[PDB]
Design a protein around this ligand. Structure first.
Ligand SMILES: C=CCNc1ncnc2ccc(Br)cc12
Lengths: 546, 163
């Protein structure tokens, strides 16, 4: 997901602005749906929600717009259990052997004969939660096992939380309402209001451990790879209690990252750290936020946002619709240099031609250079010390950069990577002169619609995830509900689309109408005021009761 | 009863629901959502009820790409009666009313559906919904950043043998 909130100090109009570009599945239980909700006099909010939820999850109101991105905070902890040496169904806490609890569930299964048979399954539980097995990593042997404590299992406040957000007046009110209830499960919140405040909150439900407990309570080997894991044989490694937290064992609101500014805040699924580089967020629990290198999407956004020039709504829209493959900026200049150094090499000819002609985009008409680039990057990622400038913590926005071609081993390995990548591209059935839009599609009935955008891991702000299906790449997730909100005098001006359209049902008039528009990158008014709604020539009305 | 909503649709089938209270508001939302997505909600409710294997057998998967039986074990565990009851009891009057309205609105559409916008008309899994079903869906999303990511791992957790 991406989000950018602009305040009075940077917006062209001196008021707030929000770009909401969540990246979510195109199908299933997290498929966004547009709606506008009004209880006249006390609730008036519009945006998108998820299946089965009677509140708006990302949206806007008279003076406020807000959105969400997936945060990097932990929302559970694993607990490594020390098993009773005499009984692997018992475990030790403070040297005392405790029995696992057993909860059986019964599931009906339809057989080949159409009849139902009953399957009984035993779920083993510790004081922390259910046991979990990842074969070869988190085993259950005679020495150890792993249990999982999920912080959101006790979060009964989630629905009330978004209903409250729906009623929020401005950025300050939004912040109060979220900090008071702490019902957000696993997302950041970014918002802007008419007055020109820009807010970032890493305000979610996060297991709490007091700072001094972490060194002894962490599992060293598991935290390196970023699994939240704790010593389950020590009662002192229970989540810490603080009466200020809305829920026992979670992190109090005052301890979670927040940035309130009048210039900008941004997030593209990295930690709170570089929300705005002018004011880095640091000194938080490892369970909360760490200073890790930012992804190419955030790096791209910050490259466009930093400086002193005013930001227009058009600028934010075009950050999405440009489909710029930002990862190419770090690699392609030097990769093209290698190409010129290896002219007359038959294995590299097609790849080097495609790359040099490529517009560096994930546009519908973008050349096969994108495909060559993707396959190369997948191999480049596996190489050691191939960066000319490695990641520099002191230059976190401009590193890593370039290929260390002056290093002979790197030059050989990078050329080999390109040869191998070219071999893979040419091995697959890709027609001559075919473009990106000919490959990446969303199926609608028996028809296909060409979809612009590319994988977020290549720094395409308009992130689109696709999977090979037959002759095409079928879109499964990414850019979904788009909303761009400004606050002119008359009322909120919202513009966007629901990329996959309102209805998942092929019979609906609204199965592919916005998808046609998404293909052409033609965003539309999101009508909010009675005037805007009444101006729509497609306006239909139904009143219902029972 | 006491359920009423005014619904306006603008271009692209975007609903604008007006009501005097939470139950009416939910009523309008549930009806509008059902018009576009009844089959989707029915499928995801089957998943959150842990009934995929019952309707579809063990060879199929959920929309989250989990095998039907492991998915069912996970959701039956997650959405046990005691857990749903406790969750319901912790809900504010306003939220209870939103959910009551939603279920009633969805169900109204189902009663009247003639297939115009519903491809799964007649399927045994397309059924009237209850507020508990909406809680099942809520809890499924609630744990997406937690134990939900370990659904397969929970199912696979079994004590060692004599090895
Ligand atoms: C994108 C917004 C994320 N919002 C949510 N994420 C997980 N669980 C949820 C449960 C209920 C509601 Br309302 C909202 C939820």
């Amino acid at each position: 997901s991406n989000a950018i909130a602009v305040g009075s100090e940077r917006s062209a109009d001196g008021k707030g602005m929000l770009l909401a570009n969540p990246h979510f599945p195109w199908n299933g239980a997290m498929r966004f749906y547009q709606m506008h909700l009004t209880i006249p006099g006390r609730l008036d909010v519009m945006g998108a929600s998820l299946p089965g939820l009677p509140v708006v999850n990302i949206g806007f109101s008279r003076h406020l717009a807000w959105t969400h991105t997936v945060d990097t905070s932990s929302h559970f902890t694993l607990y490594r259990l020390a098993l009773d040496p005499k009984d692997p169904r018992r475990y030790l806490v403070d040297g005392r052997s405790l029995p696992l609890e057993e909860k059986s569930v019964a599931i009906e299964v339809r057989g080949a004969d159409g009849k139902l048979s009953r399957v009984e399954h035993k779920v083993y539980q510790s004081i922390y939660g259910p046991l979990v097995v990842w074969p070869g990593k988190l085993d259950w042997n005679r020495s150890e096992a792993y249990a999982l404590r999920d912080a959101n299992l006790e979060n009964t406040r989630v629905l009330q939380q978004w209903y409250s957000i729906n009623q929020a007046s401005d950025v300050a009110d939004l912040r109060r309402r979220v900090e008071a209830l702490q019902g957000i499960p696993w997302v950041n919140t970014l918002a802007a209001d008419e007055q020109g405040n820009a807010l970032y909150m890493n305000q979610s439900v996060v297991p709490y451990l007091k700072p001094e407990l972490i060194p002894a309570c962490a599992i060293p080997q598991l935290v390196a790879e970023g699994l939240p894991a704790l010593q389950g044989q020590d009662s002192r490694c229970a989540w810490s209690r603080d009466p200020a937290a809305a829920q026992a064992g979670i992190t109090p609101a005052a301890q979670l990252p927040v940035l309130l500014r009048r210039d900008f805040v941004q997030n593209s699924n990295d930690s709170a750290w570089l929300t705005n580089p002018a004011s880095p967020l640091q000194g938080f629990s490892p369970l909360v936020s760490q200073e890790k290198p930012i992804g190419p999407r955030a790096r791209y956004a910050l490259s466009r946002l930093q400086g002193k020039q005013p930001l227009e709504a058009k600028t934010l829209e075009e950050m999405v619709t440009a489909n710029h493959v930002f990862s190419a900026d770090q690699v392609l200049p030097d990769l093209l240099r290698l190409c010129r150094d290896n002219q007359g090499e038959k294995s590299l000819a097609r790849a080097c031609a495609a790359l040099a002609q490529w517009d560096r985009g994930a546009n519908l008409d973008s050349g096969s250079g994108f495909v060559y680039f993707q396959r190369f990057m997948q191999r480049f990622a596996e190489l050691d010390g191939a960066w000319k400038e490695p990641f520099d913590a002191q230059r976190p926005l401009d590193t890593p950069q370039g290929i260390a071609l002056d290093r002979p081993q790197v030059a050989t390995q990078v050329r080999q990577a390109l040869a191998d990548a070219a071999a893979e591209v040419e091995k697959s059935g890709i027609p001559d002169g075919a473009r990106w839009g000919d490959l990446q599609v969303s199926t609608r009935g028996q028809e296909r619609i060409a979809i612009p955008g590319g994988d977020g891991h290549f720094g395409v702000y308009n992130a689109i995830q696709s999977v090979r299906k037959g002759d095409h790449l079928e879109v499964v997730g990414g850019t979904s509900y788009i909303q761009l909100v400004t606050f002119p005098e008359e009322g909120p001006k919202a513009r966007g689309l629901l990329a996959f359209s309102q209805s998942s049902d092929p019979r609906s008039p609204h199965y592919r109408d916005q998808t046609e528009l998404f293909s052409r990158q033609q965003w539309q008014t999101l009508p909010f005021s009675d005037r805007q709604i009444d101006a729509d020539p497609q306006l239909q009305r139904l009143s219902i009761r029972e | 009863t006491g359920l009423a909503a005014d619904i306006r649709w603008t271009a692209y089938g975007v609903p604008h629901i007006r009501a005097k209270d939470e139950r009416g508001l939910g009523y309008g939302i549930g009806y509008a959502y059902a018009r576009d997505n009844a089959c989707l909600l029915a499928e995801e409710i089957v998943t959150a009820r842990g009934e995929r294997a019952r309707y579809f057998g063990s060879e199929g998967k959920s929309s989250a790409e989990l095998d039907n039986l492991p998915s069912d074990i996970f959701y039956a565990w997650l959405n046990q009666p005691e857990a749903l009851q406790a969750f319901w009891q912790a809900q504010t009057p306003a939220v209870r009313q939103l959910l009551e309205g939603y279920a009633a609105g969805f169900n109204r559409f189902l009663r009247e559906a003639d297939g115009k916008t519903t491809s799964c008309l007649g399927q045994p899994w397309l059924r009237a919904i209850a507020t508990d079903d909406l809680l099942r869906l809520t809890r499924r999303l609630l744990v997406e950043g937690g134990v939900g990511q370990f659904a397969d791992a929970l199912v696979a957790a079994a004590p060692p043998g004599a090895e």
